[PDB]
Amino acid sequence: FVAQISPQYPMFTVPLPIPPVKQPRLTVTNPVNGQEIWYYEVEIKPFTHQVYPDLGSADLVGYDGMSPGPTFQVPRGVETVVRFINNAEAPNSVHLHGSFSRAAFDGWAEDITEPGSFKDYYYPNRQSARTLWYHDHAMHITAENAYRGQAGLYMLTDPAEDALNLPSGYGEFDIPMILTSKQYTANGNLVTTNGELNSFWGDVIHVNGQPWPFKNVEPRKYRFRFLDAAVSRSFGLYFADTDAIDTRLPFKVIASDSGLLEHPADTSLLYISMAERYEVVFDFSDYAGKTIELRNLGGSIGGIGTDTDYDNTDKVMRFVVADDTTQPDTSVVPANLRDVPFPSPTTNTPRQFRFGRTGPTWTINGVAFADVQNRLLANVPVGTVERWELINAGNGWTHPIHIHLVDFKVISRTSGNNARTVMPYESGLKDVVWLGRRETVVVEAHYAPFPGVYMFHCHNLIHEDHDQMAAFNATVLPDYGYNATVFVDPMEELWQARPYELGEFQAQSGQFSVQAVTERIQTMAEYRPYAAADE
Ligand SMILES: *[C@@H]1O[C@H](CO)[C@@H](O[C@@H]2O[C@H](CO)[C@@H](O[C@H]3O[C@H](CO)[C@@H](O)[C@H](O)[C@@H]3O)[C@H](O)[C@H]2NC(C)=O)[C@H](O)[C@H]1NC(C)=O
Ligand SMILES: *[C@@H]1O[C@H](CO)[C@@H](O)[C@H](O)[C@H]1NC(C)=O
Ligand SMILES: [Cu+2]
Ligand SMILES: [Cu+2]
Ligand SMILES: [Cu+2]
Numbered sequence: 001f002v003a004q005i006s007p008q009y010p011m012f013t014v015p016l017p018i019p020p021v022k023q024p025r026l027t028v029t030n031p032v033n034g035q036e037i038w039y040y041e042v043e044i045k046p047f048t049h050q051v052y053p054d055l056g057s058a059d060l061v062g063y064d065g066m067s068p069g070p071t072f073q074v075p076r077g078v079e080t081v082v083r084f085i086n087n088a089e090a091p092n093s094v095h096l097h098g099s100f101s102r103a104a105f106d107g108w109a110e111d112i113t114e115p116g117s118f119k120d121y122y123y124p125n126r127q128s129a130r131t132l133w134y135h136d137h138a139m140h141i142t143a144e145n146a147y148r149g150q151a152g153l154y155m156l157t158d159p160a161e162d163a164l165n166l167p168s169g170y171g172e173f174d175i176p177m178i179l180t181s182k183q184y185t186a187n188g189n190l191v192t193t194n195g196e197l198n199s200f201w202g203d204v205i206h207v208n209g210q211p212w213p214f215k216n217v218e219p220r221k222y223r224f225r226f227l228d229a230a231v232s233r234s235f236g237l238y239f240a241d242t243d244a245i246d247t248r249l250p251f252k253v254i255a256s257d258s259g260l261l262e263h264p265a266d267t268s269l270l271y272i273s274m275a276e277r278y279e280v281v282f283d284f285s286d287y288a289g290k291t292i293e294l295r296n297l298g299g300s301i302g303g304i305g306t307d308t309d310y311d312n313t314d315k316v317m318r319f320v321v322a323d324d325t326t327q328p329d330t331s332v333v334p335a336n337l338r339d340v341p342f343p344s345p346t347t348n349t350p351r352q353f354r355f356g357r358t359g360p361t362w363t364i365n366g367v368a369f370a371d372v373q374n375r376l377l378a379n380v381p382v383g384t385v386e387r388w389e390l391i392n393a394g395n396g397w398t399h400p401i402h403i404h405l406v407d408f409k410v411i412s413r414t415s416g417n418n419a420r421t422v423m424p425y426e427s428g429l430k431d432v433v434w435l436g437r438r439e440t441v442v443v444e445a446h447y448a449p450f451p452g453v454y455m456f457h458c459h460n461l462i463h464e465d466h467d468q469m470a471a472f473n474a475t476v477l478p479d480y481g482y483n484a485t486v487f488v489d490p491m492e493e494l495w496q497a498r499p500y501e502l503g504e505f506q507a508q509s510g511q512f513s514v515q516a517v518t519e520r521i522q523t524m525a526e527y528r529p530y531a532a533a534d535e
Helices: 142-147 159-164 298-302 461-465 502-507 514-526
Strands: 026-029 036-049 058-063 069-075 080-086 094-097 117-123 130-136 151-157 174-182 204-207 214-217 221-228 235-241 251-256 259-267 270-272 277-283 291-296 315-321 351-358 361-364 376-381 385-391 399-403 408-415 432-435 439-446 452-458 469-475
Touching: 026 514, 036 069, 036 514, 058 069, 069 130, 080 514, 094 117, 117 514, 130 142, 130 221, 130 277, 142 461, 151 174, 151 221, 204 315, 221 270, 235 298, 270 277, 351 399, 361 452, 361 461, 385 432, 399 439, 432 439, 452 461
Parallel strands: 036 080, 069 151, 174 221, 214 315, 351 385, 376 469
Antiparallel strands: 026 036, 036 058, 080 117, 094 130, 130 151, 174 204, 221 277, 235 270, 235 291, 251 259, 251 277, 291 315, 351 361, 385 439, 399 432, 399 452, 408 439, 452 469
């Protein structure tokens, strides 16, 4: 490893913070079905926070002026409208990662909101229970917007999964674990990602926005919701007793990007790359009175990646395990979690997408996103199941690939270094898959249920910004209906950002009056954006 560049930090001295739950402002009755739609207001604004206790503070920009943004908790079947208000200094575009939103509510990179404007995002919340996350996607400034704080968690819940009796209680035994990797100046401010064209690895590991924290835990089971929200750093996570720091302790993975696995996957090492979500149950029962360190495999994630490793990037956080529990642990991890809704399999030859570099620019089949005339790389009729072959021929870089709209099954992985194939925790449904060194992955997806133009890209945010993103069009015929003509173009004027005055927001009047919000949402709802999922 390489010497740390950021100032020395007081390791494992600050408790793991938990982002607060985001509460809706009000609900609006949907005239179509008489259901309540939950309406939220999120203010994107600059803020500072004192990351290094004995230095200066860091400049950030976040949802509701915090990083991570607040955590949404939404039950399946409840539609939501979130008004993302830009009261900051650069444009934004919000992507709810994990949601089959319509194209104009999906965070298309050109679909920006300027400072002094807001955009209303209408979300369906119909998919399987899963850990989604919302984050910036504005063209060519995504890495810095995310880095400086525009990412938060969004939990879609299902009461039918209650009976599973998994470890529960947000911030109690259900713990968000948002990972980031950054670098700090000598006075404790952030080093900018601007100017970086290869990757911004970072030498300070954060969980939920906090460098190298600790958490006091009871000797029992916890559900951890891991999310790699870093700009460029991938992880190989493992747990180890501080008395045997090299010995990986077993745990279970219970969910991936799109929701629960069919069965828990017994795991001692969890590969997790940018934008991937995995939910883990760890049992601290056997480690009462010990300290368990969450660590990160070195040698560039054990040869799967190419990331630079530093003095302390092998460390994530510490769990200090109590002698005994306060209450008995009545939670379980069932052998059978759910039936996973895999798409009907196809034998058609996969579509092929090569992720590489064309000179300094990161590209897809030699194309960059700025190239408007060539960036639409696939037309797929709505309802088609397709396999895509995702190729990383290079040994010098890696790419976690995200395909919007869909959930996909990971069919195969080859490695030119023979390092791995499909992992056990990739057994279910995902929407990001890591192309490690010399890896080719085939995925299978139902391109459904909504027509429109959607993105796919590498989710290394440096690669993404420069310029590794393309589009596909999920297409329908002229007689399809469902108001498709106003929902296929992500830049559709009907759904564009709107200017606001700060005073009317603060006074909750005008555009922000109960009447105006109610009427705006009821009118949106009349277009019935998500009806095709209700067949
Ligand atoms: C993505 O695929 C869309 C189809 O799902 C496609 O939208 C379709 O575009 C065609 C051609 O512009 C439209 O066809 C008709 O449009 C006008 C209006 O009536 C007619 O005068 C024309 O002669 C033509 O027959 C379709 O109406 C339209 N379909 C929908 C549902 O909007 C998009 O163009 C594709 N997007 C990209 C970027 O390629
Ligand atoms: C399309 O939107 C219009 C305008 O809101 C609405 O009146 C109509 O019912 C919608 N039609 C469908 C098929 O969703
Ligand atoms: Cu994402
Ligand atoms: Cu990449
Ligand atoms: Cu994206």
